[PDB]
Amino acid sequence: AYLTHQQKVLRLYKRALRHLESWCVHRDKYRYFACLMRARFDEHKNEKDMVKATQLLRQAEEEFWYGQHPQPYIFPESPGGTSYERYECYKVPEWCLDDWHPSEKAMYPDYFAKREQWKRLRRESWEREVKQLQEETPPGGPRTEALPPARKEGDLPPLWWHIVTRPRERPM
Amino acid sequence: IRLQEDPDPEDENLYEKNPDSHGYDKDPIVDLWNMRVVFFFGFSIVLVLGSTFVAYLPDYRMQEWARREAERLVKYREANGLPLMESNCFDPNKIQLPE
Amino acid sequence: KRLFIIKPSGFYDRRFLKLMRFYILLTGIPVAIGITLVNVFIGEAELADIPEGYVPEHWEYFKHPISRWIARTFY
Amino acid sequence: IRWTYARSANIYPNFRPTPKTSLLGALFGIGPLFFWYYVFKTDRDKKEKLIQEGKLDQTFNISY
Amino acid sequence: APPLTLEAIKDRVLYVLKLYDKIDPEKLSVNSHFMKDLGLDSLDQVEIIMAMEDEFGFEIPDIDAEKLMCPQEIVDYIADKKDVYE
Amino acid sequence: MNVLQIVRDHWVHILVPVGFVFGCYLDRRSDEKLTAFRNKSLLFKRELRPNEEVTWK
Amino acid sequence: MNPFASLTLTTLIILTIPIMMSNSNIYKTNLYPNYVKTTVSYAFTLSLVPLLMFMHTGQEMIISNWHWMTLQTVELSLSFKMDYFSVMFIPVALFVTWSIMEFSMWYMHSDPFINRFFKYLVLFLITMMILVTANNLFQLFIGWEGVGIMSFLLIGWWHGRTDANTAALQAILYNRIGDIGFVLSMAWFLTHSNAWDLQQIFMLNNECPNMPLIGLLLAAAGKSAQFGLHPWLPSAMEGPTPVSALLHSSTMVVAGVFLLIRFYPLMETNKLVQTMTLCLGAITTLFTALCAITQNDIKKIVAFSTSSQLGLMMVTIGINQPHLAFLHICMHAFFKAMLFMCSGSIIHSLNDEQDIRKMGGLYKAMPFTTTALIIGSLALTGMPYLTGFYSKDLIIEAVNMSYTNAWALLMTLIATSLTAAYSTRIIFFAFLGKPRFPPLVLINENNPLLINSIKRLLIGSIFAGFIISNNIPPMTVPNTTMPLYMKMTALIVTIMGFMLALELNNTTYYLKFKYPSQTYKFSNMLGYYPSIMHRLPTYHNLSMSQKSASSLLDLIWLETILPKTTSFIQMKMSIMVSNQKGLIKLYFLSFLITIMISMTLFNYHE
Amino acid sequence: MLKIIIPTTMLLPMTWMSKHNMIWINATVHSLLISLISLSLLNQLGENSLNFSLTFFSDSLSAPLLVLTTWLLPLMLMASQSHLSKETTTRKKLYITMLILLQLFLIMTFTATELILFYILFEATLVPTLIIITRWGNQTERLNAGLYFLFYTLAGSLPLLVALVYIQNTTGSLNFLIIHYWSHPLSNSWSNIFMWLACIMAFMVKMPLYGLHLWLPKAHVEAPIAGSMVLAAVLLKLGGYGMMRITTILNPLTNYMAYPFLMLSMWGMIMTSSICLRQTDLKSLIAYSSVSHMALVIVAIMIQTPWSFMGATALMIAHGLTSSMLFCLANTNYERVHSRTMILARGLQTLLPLMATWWLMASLTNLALPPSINLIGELFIITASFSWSNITIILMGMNMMITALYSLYMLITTQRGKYTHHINNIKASFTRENALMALHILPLLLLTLNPKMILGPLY
Amino acid sequence: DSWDKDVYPEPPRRTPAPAPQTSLPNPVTYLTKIFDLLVDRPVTLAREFIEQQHAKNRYYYYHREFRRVPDITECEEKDILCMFEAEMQWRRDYKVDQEIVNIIQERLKACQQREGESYRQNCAKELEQFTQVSKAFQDRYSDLGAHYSARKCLAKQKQRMLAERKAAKEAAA
């Protein structure tokens, strides 16, 4: 939505230090230069001229865009990292398990029985949670992708199934 | 409603009726028989013995007879010392080339 | 601990793969036995010179017995 | 489905013959074809010119 | 790797805030909302979540980085992102 | 054994086989008209056997 | 007709059994990795006997087995040629992959498709030992893509990783560029020399193989990842570690170099072609090493070190040194394979982290892994009397001691100094430092699978060249009278490169900070090649396919010239014909005209 | 001869008089049996073609295609009994009647001894295919597609009719043996060029070359599964068979007139394969790939070199079997997703593990990966073309380069990658689909052991 | 031996007698030794069993021989009855000549491994024999077209002595 200025500098602060970490590498240097980088950040904290803050921002990332490490440091699980969706090929959607042959389903009776319960809740909760959504939908369509919780008791929050039943990040 | 029509029918799952469905038709017993027909007269009759048929087909293109004529021809040819195989094929002595 | 792993049903694939190993081998081993058996029973013909006063049979001009039999029965 | 339509069918009905399309079609049409014709023609015009006069070697070339 | 559980996360979590010298140990609570009671500047909040990032080895997106605010809520977002349920 | 019905629903299985049986018949009938140069090409022409009269049927 | 010929062929038939057993699906779905490892182990032990028969006698076989099919004057037949090159590559390749197989179990102790993984390795392994052993060019061509496609699947082992498919697609594409050269040499040899068996080609003494050798050269460059066709190998790190430790380290990538070694007798007769062989090897040595010393991923460092080695290999084949090149293949097989599993050791144990900036202090944490890496690093640099010395020190002396391109000769020396440079970078950042990994330490190497695998390869690297050099017959001309100033160059440059690299590396310990030098901005980005040459040509050809080609011609013009124009012409004049007025007056007037023209004007009467 | 024809036509009453639900069974039983009998026909003698009568004869070229067509016949029945199950019995019987009547015409055409007899059922094959494409086709543009396919070949076939009868009135009979033995050097008189053009363009249209290939994408995409395979696995080869028979009386005019077709073909394959690299429809991508492979045959046949002919037949069988498999691949995932866009159903390997394998080996065969017959076909053509001219390898090899990219492009886009979340109807693959797939791929590898069977008369 | 030595001339093998001086045991000898009583002998025992079974019921087969027939240079114009024997006989000789080139090619390829590093000069006889055959083969069937027929082969040949005799007239001067 409104990417306000304070979020921008925090994003500037976070990624610049991450790049700065990729440069000093050694912890003592990283700690040292972060503190001075910290100091030169908060020293100019008193500007009633928000435009001047933007102007001070305009040359900031340009130096960063020169100061950026050509190979920054990313934890492998993150996008660009070595272990990005490495285990995606293993995770399979839960609905596919309904296809399983009865002999295969018989191999896991109680878990499949517990699946039946989950199928039961999602059935009546769907009507309940869709009814809650319609009765509280803002006029002229949704304004933000944010989703309301379950206002009353007992009912589940709307559109909960896929997030709750999402395959685990480490499926093997 | 434009025309009095029918909604698009839902694709029936052959598995949900009979989990041992073989995707050949609806009725189970013939489905199991369709299994037997396609695999028997497919893999078994045609693929196995058919492969042996073509593999063990008699001399095709005279590939080995041509060989057997070759060594007897070449052994004769260098026995006399004359060139191994003539550059000419239709003996020019009987050719009656114009002028 | 040990927790349920989700996986697409392999039963239909497993049954199907078992079917080739049944139906292909159904004629596989008897044929493999037969091809070997004729190679341990009557062997391979040798290149014999054409005897006088007798032109051979049409199928006789082959060394492998199966090829001769195929020529005898079909061509 | 809009993307597939716009990239499969909704081209010719929206196509209009213009010098930009006309020249581009000719440039990427007859252009490369005649270019390759010229290249292979001269190459096939240099090859036989060698062998009628015996200026090329195929002493071991039999399986042509 | 042994299954890291929520008790392990919080033990590792408040360990680092106790480490952080501006967060002195005595007033550490699992629900210690940073600037309301610790007085911790929000410009250092973007600095502690990357401290969490190296602590557990992964990236916290910026969308919830500024939302990741309470030490209990620090653990709360850690658990589901690694399906830590035990 | 339901024979009155098993033939009704399985008499189609015999048409194609007899078609192949029929197919060889015309195959072995048309060739007779094509006799002509039977044992007449000098490449294959040779003395007849004492009992056999037709070299290739 | 000794057991040599019979049992050197049965070696191949041994490794085929795990594939056939797997397809039965009765195969042990639990201990399959143990099954295949022991199978490769026996194939290795069998592979010794042809070797011990070789250095004693020196006989090399040609096994023209079952005749596939005969083409008039061509007799394409499955034929195996047990040359000295093949009789020794078989044991070392088996020995390396057997070591990899033991390491693979420990590394992939959690992969659900582990049995499929091991099956792929054998199929690759099968495809290679029919590549090295290939009496005819066709079965040599069989492996040349059998290994390539096996690389594609193995690289894309993690199917979901979008980049892995991109790297997998990249590998086959760059390989396919080389196959254009391969098939070009194929066509020439069949058209001119009327064969594909290596015997007839050599006997027909094609001493002017300008187009063939160029075709062979292009085939090698794609397979061995030379300049212009290198970046697929550095991008092939997205595959799993044992995959890269076997294929893209010392076994698959070296196939391109092995091609010219097969065709060395025709290679030396020409003078022009070997010039750009050592030219291509020279430029490859820098650019791979130049980008090597600036990367921050161990997999990136090691692979660039490999491509620098294969850059050096073709320098040897440049100036008439095929046998020493094959020697370098054997040595490169030992220590280079070790470095990857050593790096794989620290990767998996330290929570699958591959950024060289996060290790440090691992010397005491992993005494064996650190011990293994430093021996491998010294072997790669060419420490005397240990592995690389028997090949690299001979090569650097050899290329210096010959009539070569002056620039090409200088090129190898900078590479050798740069070879030590990144070697120090690995030992410095990874081991000689302070811990930088996440606080929870799970450092571990005590698993016997890792210990046995590394030690098995380690003791091989220790002696290595001493056994091979002393055992193989002296089959190259040994240069003797070297001026001492250049005979030390093999040791001077690497020791020199050690000093500056060490000084530059611990300059990071110095508190001073410097903004990126433009040279670093160039070297660290893979030498600026992937950023442009993988984005500019790909966009144009793709944009040509959609904008022009399909849309412009296939869906607009080709449907307008012939079909639509005729349809438009027919419709436009069909309407005017059918558009009649229905008044007899107009129709009868037409008859009067029709009578008039027919009678007189059209001369129908006369 | 008649041992294959009568059983084929006698199969027609069987389907019409079979039980209500046994039609698929009994047809499949004997369609496989016919292939077995046709497999016996595959034997060939040394040099004389296997001649049966004035009406029918077979050589080393017709027999591999004959066994291919009869072998195909069960496969459409196998591949069609999924979208026709909910149809009235008469329409199912009428559908089955179309294929076997079509399959009858192919057997007659390849075995024909007289060019006119070859010509009559050369056109007769279209009538059943036009019915199949239009009636049972599942789309809207099938109507225009049927018109495009029908009119294109007719526009080329009718000039052949005038050409063929001209040979009859000038050189007596058009029997293949008599025309081959009494061949005369065709002059370069400006009429003989138009004589040459008429005798060639008919096969050119139903052998899609660049420019005259726009009927193929609309025909292949819009036709049902059975129609797509038959039109791509045997029908395109009808043009190929025509040339090997008909260029007997087109030399040395073929030496000079080949250039415009060679230039259109060699450049066309690069263009068409480029289209494959950016196709949105999976069936269209497979269709355009057929253009590239067929365009490769165009160069092969028009060169008129022993090696070129041998590779021409090799690619002829290999491409047909492979394209039939790929159309099965596209058909097998289509009804699951009910759309043809490639990117709609990604990551199918995770959901369907065996289809990943089947689609994998389908890609390798289309890749001309050695030693698949596709490689033998392509590699043979490369050497023949290279001897013709050295430059063509640049065009020739670049096609193999582009062929690698698009062939794997479908694999990565569909099989590999992240599964699309919204779809939930993908059921475990029916064993019929799996069996049909192995029915295709397995004989291809079986043929690898005996290339001599499919090399052709030049062998 | 099954094949003929004249067709496949094999120069006698010069195998040196083993004469080692080093005292430590020569391993390779042992590997051949333990191979002999583990693989070679059991193979031989099975082989002598199959051979005696084969000779128990021995069935024969001969080699088909085609007698000479009038070829195309004396076959009357048109008259395809005579053309058939002419064409078939010529095509039979084509396959024989193709096999003749094959026999030479194997002999040439056999020298390569047989002569080892001496291949360049030891079997120059093999090289010239193939050169003589390949050149003669070119004058016989090369560039005949994919639709080659005995008429074309006669046609191509008839040009050869046409140019040759024309050259002979020029040479005579």
Ligand SMILES: CCCCCCCCCCCCCCCCCC(=O)O[C@@H](COC(=O)CCCCCCCCCCCCCCC)COP(=O)(O)OC[C@H](O)CO
């Ligand atoms: C959709 C358009 C056509 C598509 C492409 C088809 C192929 C292009 C060429 C089409 C030629 C069609 C007519 C060919 C019939 C057989 C030709 C033949 O056998 O050769 C004769 C060639 O003779 C001709 O004149 C043939 C026709 C030449 C072209 C003129 C008509 C065809 C073009 C217009 C009609 C088709 C175009 C579509 C119109 C709507 C030999 O006779 P001759 O002239 O040598 O006779 C002896 C003496 O010299 C005098 O007779």
